[PDB]
Design an enzyme around this catalytic site. Sequence first.
Site, PDB file in Angstrom:
ATOM      1  N   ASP A  36       7.540   0.671  -2.921  1.00  0.00           N
ATOM      2  CA  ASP A  36       7.260   1.089  -1.135  1.00  0.00           C
ATOM      3  C   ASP A  36       7.912   1.543  -0.333  1.00  0.00           C
ATOM      4  O   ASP A  36       8.303  -0.205   0.313  1.00  0.00           O
ATOM      5  CB  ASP A  36       6.231   0.067  -1.311  1.00  0.00           C
TER       6      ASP A  36
ATOM      7  N   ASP B 146       6.898   6.899   4.462  1.00  0.00           N
ATOM      8  CA  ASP B 146       6.513   5.584   3.345  1.00  0.00           C
ATOM      9  C   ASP B 146       6.422   6.094   2.222  1.00  0.00           C
ATOM     10  O   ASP B 146       5.552   6.447   1.169  1.00  0.00           O
ATOM     11  CB  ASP B 146       5.033   5.179   3.995  1.00  0.00           C
TER      12      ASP B 146
HETATM   13  C1  LIG Z   1       1.663  -3.199  11.619  1.00  0.00           C
HETATM   14  C2  LIG Z   1       1.439  -2.786   9.503  1.00  0.00           C
HETATM   15  O1  LIG Z   1       1.181  -3.052   9.342  1.00  0.00           O
HETATM   16  N1  LIG Z   1       1.231  -1.104   9.577  1.00  0.00           N
HETATM   17  C3  LIG Z   1       1.385  -0.599   8.920  1.00  0.00           C
HETATM   18  C4  LIG Z   1       2.762   0.649   8.091  1.00  0.00           C
HETATM   19 CL1  LIG Z   1       3.864   0.191   9.141  1.00  0.00          CL
HETATM   20  C5  LIG Z   1       2.497   0.979   6.919  1.00  0.00           C
HETATM   21  C6  LIG Z   1       1.108   1.064   6.137  1.00  0.00           C
HETATM   22  C7  LIG Z   1       1.262   1.379   4.994  1.00  0.00           C
HETATM   23  N2  LIG Z   1       1.237   0.297   3.942  1.00  0.00           N
HETATM   24  C8  LIG Z   1       2.099   0.380   3.097  1.00  0.00           C
HETATM   25  N3  LIG Z   1       3.393   1.534   2.913  1.00  0.00           N
HETATM   26  N4  LIG Z   1       2.018  -0.521   1.909  1.00  0.00           N
HETATM   27  C9  LIG Z   1       2.052  -1.835   1.936  1.00  0.00           C
HETATM   28  O2  LIG Z   1       0.600  -1.852   3.122  1.00  0.00           O
HETATM   29  C10 LIG Z   1       1.997  -2.542   0.828  1.00  0.00           C
HETATM   30  N5  LIG Z   1       1.006  -3.586   0.670  1.00  0.00           N
HETATM   31  C11 LIG Z   1      -0.508  -3.837   0.455  1.00  0.00           C
HETATM   32  C12 LIG Z   1      -1.218  -4.729   0.592  1.00  0.00           C
HETATM   33  C13 LIG Z   1      -0.589  -5.175   1.110  1.00  0.00           C
HETATM   34  C14 LIG Z   1      -0.385  -6.406   1.705  1.00  0.00           C
HETATM   35  C15 LIG Z   1      -0.083  -6.890   3.033  1.00  0.00           C
HETATM   36  C16 LIG Z   1       1.200  -6.403   3.675  1.00  0.00           C
HETATM   37  C17 LIG Z   1       1.242  -4.959   2.686  1.00  0.00           C
HETATM   38  C18 LIG Z   1       0.200  -4.689   2.061  1.00  0.00           C
HETATM   39  C19 LIG Z   1       0.323   0.420   6.797  1.00  0.00           C
HETATM   40  C20 LIG Z   1       0.589  -0.468   8.159  1.00  0.00           C
HETATM   41 CL2  LIG Z   1      -1.464  -0.855   8.763  1.00  0.00          CL
END
Ligand SMILES: CC(=O)Nc1c(Cl)cc(CNC(=N)NC(=O)Cn2ccc3ccccc32)cc1Cl
EC number: 3.4.23.46
Length: 375
Positions: A221, A37
């Site tokens: 990302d 990530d």
């Molecule tokens: C089920 C799920 O989405 N798990 C998850 C994963 Cl796989 C990676 C991450 C770490 N996140 C990122 N590397 N990037 C983001 O979250 C980008 N992002 C930033 C705002 C946002 C809103 C909806 C979806 C993605 C979004 C957080 C979660 Cl909760």
Amino acid sequence: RGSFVEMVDNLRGKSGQGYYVEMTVGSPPQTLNILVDTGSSNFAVGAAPHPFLHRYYQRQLSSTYRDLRKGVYVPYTQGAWAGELGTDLVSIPHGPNVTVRANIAAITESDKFFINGSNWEGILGLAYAEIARPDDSLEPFFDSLVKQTHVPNLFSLQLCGAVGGSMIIGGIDHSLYTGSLWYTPIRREWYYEVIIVRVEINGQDLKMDCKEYNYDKSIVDSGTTNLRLPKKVFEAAVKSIKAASSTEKFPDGFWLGEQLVCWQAGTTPWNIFPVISLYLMGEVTNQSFRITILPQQYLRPVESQDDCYKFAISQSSTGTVMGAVIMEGFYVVFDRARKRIGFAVSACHVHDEFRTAAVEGPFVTLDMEDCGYNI
Ligand SMILES: CC(=O)Nc1c(Cl)cc(CNC(=N)NC(=O)Cn2ccc3ccccc32)cc1Cl
């Protein structure tokens, strides 16, 4: 093959569920599958049973584990987790030939973080300390790797869509790309922040102020699937993509990612969807380059004789996010040492006989310094 050959094909995953690498923690060894990530900065592993985890980190079995006696909580828009900080020995068996002592968050409770069937049990946040939790004093993994060993301050990612791919650590493997690498500056070291200066759909300029493309940031990302675009840009992009594909009719909800459309096995009319180009700021004054993806990148296959697809460009309120939809077209070099990100056409990217992903330049773009958001 090349000197980095043992790191080739070290990533696995299920489509849309993230790419992971094996990491070995503690003593005696405990190997876990870890989501790669570039959009976060914590190294964290499941450390207690969970319905979606096949295995987890058992600190009591690791003689080298050191408790930091501090909790940690990491929220996202779509989920969160809580846990306990410590350090332990960490190696990447299909990565560099070193072992480091790294911070590790032992995830004890979580909400909608783990993904059923994804086969990963933790997350490797490769971005910078500024966005680490609980704060920027918690040294991220890659920072520890560079501080403790000879490994050069650079890694590169080839994400191969439908999955697998390569994370080359300490260098570049030339078998993973074709053509030339083109570099964009890392604007600031927190996320891997970049500047988008122009957007085209099938060669047609969206014609928005470039400030909109980067409001309030643009980042690379690997931990998220979609290309996410600021609202105004998303709306304009959808209008343009619809216009370019107007020989076919799709329900409004398809463009919102709320409806899928399916084709009979092997009949997907890729040619009726447009290519999408992002121009990125280059390394020389007034110079840019462009990366171009295909519908094979932005239409994702989900879960017979029917091939169903989801439109994976979505609306964002946190700026542009260049997720797997972008990264799957390219070999992406995170050249931390030179504060830049390189893109080249991926040797593994999914395409057809008529179109390929592309990285092209140079172009002349003026006033690019104004595109970035401030404060
Ligand atoms: C089920 C799920 O989405 N798990 C998850 C994963 Cl796989 C990676 C991450 C770490 N996140 C990122 N590397 N990037 C983001 O979250 C980008 N992002 C930033 C705002 C946002 C809103 C909806 C979806 C993605 C979004 C957080 C979660 Cl909760």
